[PDB]
Structure formats: C-alpha cells, structure tokens
C-alpha cells in the first residue's frame, strides 16, 4: 500500500490512450521520458521519498466533457508527476467515468468539472470537497470564493462562489499566493542570428503593432510562425512548426517579440530556455477583470503589469525586457541592448521536471484541508510584515523576496498574538473584510478578521496598514518554504 516510484511509462500510455484528446501528450511524454525518469530518480536521491502512502487519485477533465461545450500540457504534467510518484490514477473525461469512479483520496479537477462533481454526487459532494485540488489557471481570490461576500460586493462570477479553502485552487503561474501554484514543465527538445521572432500565431494579434514592429525591424529581421493583413511584408514567415522545429528556430533567434497577447503563456519561457530574450509589453494601466474583456467574470481582481508578469518579476533582465510599447525610445534601447548582449539559456527551477515533481510531491504529502485550519507550512516559516496603505499582503511579501502564506493569517488575528510581532493594540474591533487584520499606526487601533474564510493575501487597505503573513521559499521554488519538504 506504499507508493513505489515508476520508471516505465507503458502503463501511462495505455491509460492516456483511452482518451483521444491525449494523442499529442503521449508523443510529448515519449520525448520527455528521459528527463522525467532522471528527475524522479534525482528527487529520490535528494529527499526521503520512502514510506509514502499510495493514493487513489481521481483526475476529472471537465473541459473535455461534451456537456461543458468547450490547458492540456498542465494536465499531462500533473498526471505524469502522479504516475512517476507511484500513485493510482483514475482519469475521467465524461460524466459516465466520473460517476463510476465516484476509496478515493485526491481529486484533481477544474471548475467546470467541479459543477459536474457537485451534480453527480448530490449533497454528499461536500463530504469530499476537502480532497479537491481545482486546476484554475488565472486563480481565485478569496473575495470571489466566499459566496456571501461576493454577493455583498456585487461580484458576478460564473467561476467563483465555491467556498473552498482558496489554497485548494491550483494556478498556472505563481501570481496568486492565496492559491497554490501548480504550473507545468516547459519541454526542452534539445548559432544565433541578428533576428527576432514574433510571439503570436494569429494575424489579428498583430493589429496596430506596425510602428512597434518597424522599430525592431530597424535592427533585426522579423520572423513569424503565423497561419496576413496586419503582418508587414518584410516579415519572414515560417508557417506552423513542430515543437522541435520551433526550438531550433529559437536557438537561431536573439529576441522573442511579445505583442501584448496572449497573456501568461508557456511560449516566452520556452524562448528564454533556448537563449532568447523576451520583449515583454508593459501594461499601463495593469489589465484585470475590471478593464479587459478577456478577464471579465474571472474570480479574481488580479492585475497583470505586463503580458507575462511571471517573466517580468521572477526572471527579469537580461532575459526579459518589460517595456511600454508606446515609449519608442525605450523599445529602441531594449532591442539594441539585446542585439550585442550575450544571454545564456535560463529555465526557472519550478518549471523543470524535477521542480514540478518536488512541488507536487510536497503538495500530496503535506497539504491536508480535511481537519479545519492548516499546519503546513510550519509556523516556523512565519515572517510577519506590515504592508503600507495602498499595498497588499502579496506585495509587501514579494518586495522582501518572500511570499504571502494564507495559512498563517490565523496566527495574526487577536490582541495577544499581535504582541509577538511588535504591534500593540490599545483597542480592537472585528470586521468581516478581506483587508483585515488591519493595523492603525497613527492611532493604536486594530481590526481583526471575523470571518476566517475572508483571509486574503490580495487587497490593499486604502488608509491603514495590513498585518501580512509572509514566508521564505526555496530558491526558484516559490510554492515551498525551505522547511516545507
Ligand atoms: C483551460 C483554461 O485556462 N481554463 C481556465 C478558464 O479559461 C477560460 C476558458 O473558457 C472556456 C469557455 O468558457 C465558457 O464559460 C465560455 O466563456 C466560452 O466562451 C469559453 O470558451 O478556457 C479558455 C481556453 S479554451 C480560456 O481562454 C478562458 O479564459 O478560466 C477559468 C476562470 O479563470 C479558469 O478557472 C480555468 O482554469
């Protein structure tokens, strides 16, 4: 009944072949087989992976059911990680298989599949909800997760209102510390020219970018991989390329040119992994559900400061140049600096096979939401910081090379507890608000949280200071504190 790491993928191929939609993921795993097997072996050498309980795991892809009416790289890398860790995976892609499978101990599912889960099981779905790990690309902030609080704000979300522990939501990039960062692996299939490659397979992505692209064209060739109105005539199109052929072109390319869309994708990381610089359009104002139709109705008010905020903040220069495209002299300076500077290929640790294996194994072994409030990460990692007015708990932790840990909020929510962190409450009141525990420096006063489901890393107090729980993290592995293994 103990998990045994796997080093042969034959059983995984037979599992994935039962679903036609995984055809190209089976091809991707076969390419990445050696990288996966070397990573699981390396993880078993660096950490004690013995005596782990074998878990029966449901993986329900709601987006693949025909009832949804409706991405897959994350699912495959999650399934592969579970498989290599030795767990018992039951893949579901319809209401029928979901009914049959529903002895289960972990449920990976998307929000669309979650509504199918609630309907298939009826009221006893809440009996299982602490086992849910909800793949939610753009993240869910507590303001939208708390159904009654969402109504009080007027939030119209088809995606929120689920009243889960917000750490049960698993995001595509570490942009929402209220959630868990699941991510994926950037596949690496493997002389550089004065040429750029535009990020964008759709011609409509190129509208209005002529002035922008003309600046780059002054210094480099402009290449593309497009399916042609908005494409300048000087663009050297390559057509659609296999992933392997795309990476050879990336090794030939100095600059990967972002157009502003799509947001938060894997392609910039794959460019950087092959020695490309990424020109990352900066957004003023930042784009969110409040001002961008692409984000309308998302269960979050997160603001994207650029096309790829992860690349902007967690990678940065010299690999990522975040520039407002209207600042033509700044764009000229960036393209020119990238022209002579030699950058070496860079891949963040958390987006490698071993990084994800370590991350997902820690989540499986340490994340427990079935006994009320949480005890992992350990309290030892708690580093308290006070955010300034207009600053969120996410920001005050990030600026100090830490990250907000929502499970620590419970330890900063009363008078006596605040003494340990050098904040003296002459007087205290309680509020049900995502912005508390708030501190009042100009006047003694503390406001504590009256609804524990409203603990929120996101959100900035407009007048007061926020008491913010931060934690360290293993370098290149934002999801794990140093003592979290
Ligand atoms: C795969 C993925 O990223 N899913 C996230 C989802 O992303 C949106 C989703 O929209 C699908 C479908 O949704 C219906 O409600 C209608 O609005 C349809 O018009 C729409 O096509 O998937 C597409 C990619 S196919 C993506 O572009 C959408 O943004 O968003 C939710 C909420 O943030 C997230 O939880 C899912 O993980």
Residue numbers in the entry: 214 to 283, 297 to 328, 345 to 432, 444 to 480, 484 to 741
Q: Which passages does the manuscript contain on this structure?
A:
Human GnT-V is a type II membrane protein and comprises 741 amino acids in total. GnT-V acts only on the α1-6 mannose branch of N-glycans, and this process is highly regulated. Mechanistically, the β1-6 branch glycan modification by GnT-V allows target proteins to be decorated with a number of N-acetyllactosamine (LacNAc) residues, creating high-affinity ligands for galectins.
Consequently, we designed a new truncated construct of GnT-V luminal domain, mini-GnT-V, in which N-terminal domain (T121-N212) was deleted. Also, the long unstructured loop (K330-R344), involved in an interregional disulfide bond (C172-C338), was replaced with a short linker of four glycine residues to reduce the structural heterogeneity. The asymmetric unit contains two mini-GnT-V inhibitor complexes, referred to as complex A and B. Structural superposition of the two complexes demonstrated that overall RMSD value of Cα atoms is only 0.76 Å. Of note, one difference is that the weak electron density of a highly mobile region (G282-G296) is observed in complex B and included in the final model. The trisaccharide moiety binds to mini-GnT-V between the two middle domains. Among the three sugar residues, both GlcNAc-3 and Man-2 are buried in the cavity and tightly bind to mini-GnT-V via direct and water-mediated interactions, whereas Man-1 is exposed to solvent. Notably, two aromatic rings of F380 and W401 contact the trisaccharide and the side chain of W401 and seem to restrain the conformation of the α1-6 branch.
